[PDB]
Nucleic acid binder design. Structure first.
Ligand SMILES: Nc1ncnc2c1ncn2[C@@H]1O[C@H](COP(=O)(O)O)[C@@H](O)[C@H]1O
Length: 152
DNA sequence: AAACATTCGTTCACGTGAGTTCCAGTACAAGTCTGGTC
């Protein structure tokens, strides 16, 4: 039902969205409808961190989610708790969580660089993107893993 | 020969250092909140 509603919103159709929501309402209880509303809004407020959920799911799941950024692969590969992954590293056509930068104090900057020469670069204002190229197959991914390939 | 002073092992009290348990405070991760823009 959620897939139908999302695709149908993407297709510029509202009568079908109304039908799907009506079916969900008619075939749900008050608590189920409340939870469904929370998932639609994309907030649950469970009080438990996503990192905790991933850790309980498998020993090495946060790293795999960072490298891949797709709940399907993490859920599929990490099924048997005993069986782990030998080596996890960036792979083609799979979004990876970008590496960010933290505030720095000009006074102790040299100390933060272990008293060694460093690189100074200009700050760029705009979107953060990553490009995957294999032959003439191109994929573009945004900061959080959304696919912007259609635009570019 | 008898009385008084000094000394020594003993006793009590008090003070100081080291080990154990319980609790206040701090740095940072993550959740949550919010503003502006097209
Ligand atoms: N040259 C750069 N290299 C890597 N990240 C950058 C660069 N310029 C801007 N950023 C991104 O911009 C963020 C800081 O925002 P600032 O730019 O307003 C960083 O955490 C990066 O995600």
């Amino acid at each position: 039902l959620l897939d139908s509603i999302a695709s149908n919103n993407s297709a510029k159709r509202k009568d079908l969205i109304k039908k799907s929501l009506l079916q969900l309402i008619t075939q749900s209880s008050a608590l189920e409808q409340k939870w469904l509303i929370r998932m639609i809004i994309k907030d649950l407020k469970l009080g438990v961190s996503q990192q905790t959920i991933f850790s309980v799911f498998h020993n090495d799941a946060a790293e795999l989610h960072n490298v891949t950024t797709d709940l399907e692969k993490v859920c599929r590969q990490l099924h048997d708790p005993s069986v782990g992954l030998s080596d996890i590293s960036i792979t083609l056509f799979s979004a990876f969580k970008p590496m960010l930068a933290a505030i720095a104090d000009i006074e102790h900057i040299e100390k933060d660089m272990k008293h060694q020469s460093f690189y100074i670069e200009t700050k760029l204002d705009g979107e953060r993107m990553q490009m995957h190229k294999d032959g003439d197959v191109y994929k573009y991914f945004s900061r959080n893993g959304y696919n912007y390939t259609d635009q570019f």
